[PDB]
Amino acid sequence: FLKNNWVLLSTVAAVVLGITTGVLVREHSNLSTLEKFYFAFPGEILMRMLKLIILPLIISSMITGVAALDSNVSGKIGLRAVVYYFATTLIAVILGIVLVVSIKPGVTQKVGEIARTGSTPEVSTVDAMLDLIRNMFPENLVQAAFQQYKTKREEEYKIVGMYSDGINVLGLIVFALVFGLVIGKMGEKGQILVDFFNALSDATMKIVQIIMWYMPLGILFLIAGCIIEVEDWEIFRKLGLYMATVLTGLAIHSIVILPLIYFIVVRKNPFRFAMGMAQALLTALMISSSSATLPVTFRCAEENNQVDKRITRFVLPVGATINMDGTALYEAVAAVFIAQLNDLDLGIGQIITISITATSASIGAAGVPQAGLVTMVIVLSAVGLPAEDVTLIIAVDCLLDRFRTMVNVLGDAFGTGIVEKLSKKELEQMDVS
Numbered sequence: 308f309l310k311n312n313w314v315l316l317s318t319v320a321a322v323v324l325g326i327t328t329g330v331l332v333r334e335h336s337n338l339s340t341l342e343k344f345y346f347a348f349p350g351e352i353l354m355r356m357l358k359l360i361i362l363p364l365i366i367s368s369m370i371t372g373v374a375a376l377d378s379n380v381s382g383k384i385g386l387r388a389v390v391y392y393f394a395t396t397l398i399a400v401i402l403g404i405v406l407v408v409s410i411k412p413g414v415t416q417k418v419g420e421i422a423r424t425g426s427t428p429e430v431s432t433v434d435a436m437l438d439l440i441r442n443m444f445p446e447n448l449v450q451a452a453f454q455q456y457k458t459k460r461e462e463e464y465k466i467v468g469m470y471s472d473g474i475n476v477l478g479l480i481v482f483a484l485v486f487g488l489v490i491g492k493m494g495e496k497g498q499i500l501v502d503f504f505n506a507l508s509d510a511t512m513k514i515v516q517i518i519m520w521y522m523p524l525g526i527l528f529l530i531a532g533c534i535i536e537v538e539d540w541e542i543f544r545k546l547g548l549y550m551a552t553v554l555t556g557l558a559i560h561s562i563v564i565l566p567l568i569y570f571i572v573v574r575k576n577p578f579r580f581a582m583g584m585a586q587a588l589l590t591a592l593m594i595s596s597s598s599a600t601l602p603v604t605f606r607c608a609e610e611n612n613q614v615d616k617r618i619t620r621f622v623l624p625v626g627a628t629i630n631m632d633g634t635a636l637y638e639a640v641a642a643v644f645i646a647q648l649n650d651l652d653l654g655i656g657q658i659i660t661i662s663i664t665a666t667s668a669s670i671g672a673a674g675v676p677q678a679g680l681v682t683m684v685i686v687l688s689a690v691g692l693p694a695e696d697v698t699l700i701i702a703v704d705c706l707l708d709r710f711r712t713m714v715n716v717l718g719d720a721f722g723t724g725i726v727e728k729l730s731k732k733e734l735e736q737m738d739v740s
Contacts, residue, residue: 314519314522314586315585315586315589317523318522318523318526318586318589318590319589320523321523321524321526321527321530322526322527322530322589322593324527325526325527325528325529325530325531326530326531326534328527328531329530329531329532329533329534329535330534332346332531332535333534333535333537338535343532343535343536346528346531346532346535347528347529347531347532348528349524349525349527349528349529350525350526350528350529350532352525353518353521353522353524353525353526353528353529354525354529354594354599356518356521356525357518357594357596357599358599360511360514360515360518360599360602361474361476361598361599361601362452362474362479363507363511364508364511364512364515364601364602365476365479365480365483365598365601365624365627366479366483367504367505367507367508367511368508368605368620368623368624369480369483369484369487369620369621369624370483370486370487370490370504371487371501371504371505371508371620372487372617372620372621372624373483373484373486373487373488373491373621374487374488374490374491374497374501374504375491375617375620376491376617376621376737377491377737378488378491378492380730380733380737381488381491381621383730383733384618384621384622384726384730385621385625387726387729387730388621388622388625388626388722388726391722391725391726392626392629392630392722395564395565395568395632395718396630396631396632396635396666396669396670397666398560398564399560399564399632399633399635399636400635400636400639400662400665400666400669401662402556402559402560402564402636403556403560403635403636403637403639403640404639404640404643404658404661404662404665406552406555406556406559406640407552407556407639407640407643407644408643408653408658410548410551410552411647412548412549412551412552412644412647413548413549413644413645413647413648414647416545416548416648417648418648418649418696418699420545421545421546421648421699422542422545422699422702423696423699423701423702424538424698424701424702425697425698425701425702425704427680427684427694427695427697427698428677428680428681428684429459430680430681430684430685430688430694431459431460432685432688432689434458434459434460434466435671435672435681435685436671437458438456438457438458439671439672439673441456441458441468442455442456442475442477442478442674443477443478443481444478444481445475445478445482448482450470451475451478451479451482452474452475452479453472453473453474454470454471454472454473454475455470455471455472455473455474455475455674456468456469456470456475457469457470457471471676473674473676475674476598476627476628476674477628477673477674480624480625480628508620511602512602512605512606515602515603515606526593529593529594530593533705538702542702542703543703546699546700546702546703549641549644549700549703550703550706550707552640552644553636553637553640553641553707553710554707554710556636556640557633557636557637557710557711557714560632560636560714561713561714561717565577565717565718565721566578566581566721568721568725569721569724569725572725572728572729573724573725573728577721580612580720580721580724581717581720581721583607583608583611583612583720584604584607584608584611584612584716584717584720585607586603586607587600587603587604587607587608587716587717587720588713588716588717590603590716591712591713591715591716592709592710592712592713593709594712595708595709595711595712596712597627597628597630597712597715597716598627598628600712600716601623601624601627604623604716604719604720605619605623607720608623608720608723612720612724614723614724614727615727615734617734618723618726618727618734619723622719622722622723622726622727623719623723626715626718626722626723627719628673628674629670629673630715630718630719631666631669631670631673632711632714632715632718633710633711633712633714633715634669634678634679634682634711635665635666635669635670637707637711638665638668638669638679638682638683638686639661639662639665639686641683641700642661642665642683642686642687642690643661645687645692645696645697645699645700646661646690646692648696648699649692649696651690651691651692657690660689661686661689661690664685664686664689665682665686668681668682668685668686669682671685672685679704679708680697680701683697683700684697
């Protein structure tokens, strides 16, 4: 069974051992705030090794995927992917809103009992909405690789902007799409660029395999460190009802709705397909970064489910930044919970508008240093409540952030399969013309 299955067995063993190690250390030992940071050094090294692959992999994969297809074919695949993402995001938002209202988590609990912590960021609705369009078209290609644009209101008020560290993935993806479309129609005059980017994509994909050898140790030291820096278990019991709603919504959306759509569109068993990405699911659960888990998703989808490369290379990078299913559901549930906690009554129109604004703001903060805080604040401002009540959820915002990634990755795989099957005619016809 070994060699055939070594990476998955090592990852499972490391995940099992890390929880035990972390529980034992915290229980029977006392560590200072400085000593708790040196215990997670291998995890940080793994995190900053995985962050180094995102730029070349994304750029080369997007260019290669776009340039391979014809101009007429690419638009149809993009339209299908966009429609599927939008529809399932709407479905997830609806499911989350109804689920939190039905159970009624914050009817009994009062705001006074619950403590709060964290720093609420400064947020402007229209400014944040326009910052997305600004970041879609960066002023500099080199600066876009490690900086982002932000604007703030100051002084009867003026608008001033500045650049801050953080990879701009939206602008890079848009430019890669445009460049691939341009060089795909040049014919012979762009073949050198096509070959260069194909070789770069292959070389980048071969480097992740080296990191996969060190991955189990970093995973073991990464999950143990999360169970040593936990503040206390009092807040977990004080917020147990809140976590139940989000977890139930995520589980329902992952188990019922997505396989239902997959079985309706394509006539295949949807559970073996999900099993084929188990390593990707564990990677998403631990690292909890949809962008950093991209190479593992590529390897799992292409090698284990026989999905066409020309479909993954175009769909998966796009889905790495645009899919908002987990984010939108969590934000909607948390906003309704905060509204229930305070003296606010939710009507039908209020529910509809809060769902609409949650759906819009989930994708509005597509790329932000702390996007979960921006989206919640916008929804709370829309409903009336201030941004100072977001600090209640921050105490458990490190546990529910990990669960969303696996759902997003699994849904991206399902959408890749659905889009590949939905355009089978042009995939079997472009091979000869």
